Design a protein around this ligand. Structure first.
Ligand SMILES: NC(=O)c1c(F)ccc(OCc2nc(-c3ccc(C(F)(F)F)cc3)c(Br)o2)c1F
Ligand SMILES: Nc1nc2c(ncn2[C@@H]2O[C@H](COP(=O)(O)OP(=O)(O)O)[C@@H](O)[C@H]2O)c(=O)[nH]1
Ligand SMILES: [Ca+2]
Length: 305
């Protein structure tokens, strides 16, 4: 049974983790990593690592990614110890600050050294934060890409595409944080449940090990044309930087009730295939959940660009 850990690094990453702790994911271990002792003290994470006590005296890294990097390197043994035994690690962080930008790639590097399939989920700053913030964040993203197995990048500007003029900022932030939450829940489902056409953690590693940026999504529909609608929703991910176009690897699962038809499954798979590379390494799964009535749920991860 694969062990999952979710690690928040710096403010934005810990914000994401705090929402997940609030909802509950009993089988998943949450780890909070920060330079900022005040923020870390308020976290309800079961496992906390204050990095850079010597460097920052319990303050943040003040927008200097070199300080975040050095803080993580200084606490390497603590980070190793907290990760040890994980089969899969998610590292969540907002790029552009001091702590996440610098520390998150070190954490991801350690995770992979400890043997974990390592997935980064990171944001790029809003354009309103300025070119400097954006340039620091880009360096972070590239460092993350080099350290992880697979990277999911959410430009914060994409949040401006999903709000109306009154949508509360915290509600917009919840939508961005749901990318991580739904990714973790979906992998938990994959590991826990034996499928009629079973996918397991070795299939996840095949598609996700030593890749780069990825598209992930989930689509739910019912009624007429449900399979096509669910597939299209799964592959259209308005918050992610990466599109499915040209994908060389896909992991795809369809979950339906007892009415799930072979014809529908083909329709959904063809939607996903059509979008990917013609030599796509596609691994397809199915689970029948008799508790469902007319809903279909299509889950996709696409890698290799
Ligand atoms: N067919 C199965 O054995 C199966 C099951 F029984 C339940 C769920 C399930 O798939 C859920 C699923 N989860 C993923 C997935 C893929 C990637 C990630 C990521 F990127 F790590 F976030 C998270 C989740 C995918 Br593609 O599909 C199955 F494949
Ligand atoms: N979407 C989202 N972005 C955030 C959040 N908090 C911070 N950010 C973004 O993450 C960047 C770095 O902030 P933060 O993680 O607090 O800095 P650090 O603690 O110094 O790593 C900011 O420049 C924002 O673009 C959040 O809760 N949600
Ligand atoms: Ca399974």
């Amino acid at each position: 049974m694969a062990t999952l850990k979710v690690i928040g690094v710096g403010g934005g990453g810990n914000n994401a983790v705090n929402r997940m702790i609030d909802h509950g994911m009993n089988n998943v271990e949450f780890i909070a990593i920060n330079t900022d002792g005040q923020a870390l003290n308020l976290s309800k994470a079961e496992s906390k690592i204050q990095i850079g006590e010597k460097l920052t005296r319990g303050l943040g890294a003040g927008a200097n990614p070199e300080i975040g990097k050095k803080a993580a390197e200084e606490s390497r043994e603590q980070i190793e110890d907290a990760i040890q035994g994980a089969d899969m690690v998610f590292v969540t962080s907002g790029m552009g600050g001091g702590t996440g930008t610098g520390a998150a790639p070190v954490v991801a590097k350690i995770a992979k050294e400890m043997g974990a399939l390592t997935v980064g989920v990171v944001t790029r700053p809003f354009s309103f934060e300025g070119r400097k913030r954006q340039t620091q964040a880009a360096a972070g993203v590239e460092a993350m890409k080099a350290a992880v197995d697979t990277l999911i990048v959410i430009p914060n500007d994409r949040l401006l595409d999903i709000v109306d003029k009154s949508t509360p900022m915290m509600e917009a932030f919840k939508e961005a944080d749901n990318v991580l939450r739904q990714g973790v829940q979906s992998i938990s489902d994959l590991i826990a449940v034996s499928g009629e056409v079973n996918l397991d953690f070795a299939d996840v590693k095949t598609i996700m090990s030593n890749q780069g940026s990825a598209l992930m999504g989930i689509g739910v529909s019912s009624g007429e044309n449900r399979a096509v609608e669910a597939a299209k929703k799964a592959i259209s991910s308005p918050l992610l930087e990466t599109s499915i176009v040209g994908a060389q690897g896909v992991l795809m699962n369809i979950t339906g009730g007892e009415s799930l038809s072979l014809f529908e499954a083909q329709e959904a798979a063809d939607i996903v295939q059509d979008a990917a590379d013609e030599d796509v390494n596609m691994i397809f799964g199915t689970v029948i959940n008799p508790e469902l009535q007319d809903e279909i749920v299509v889950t996709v991860i696409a890698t290799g660009f």
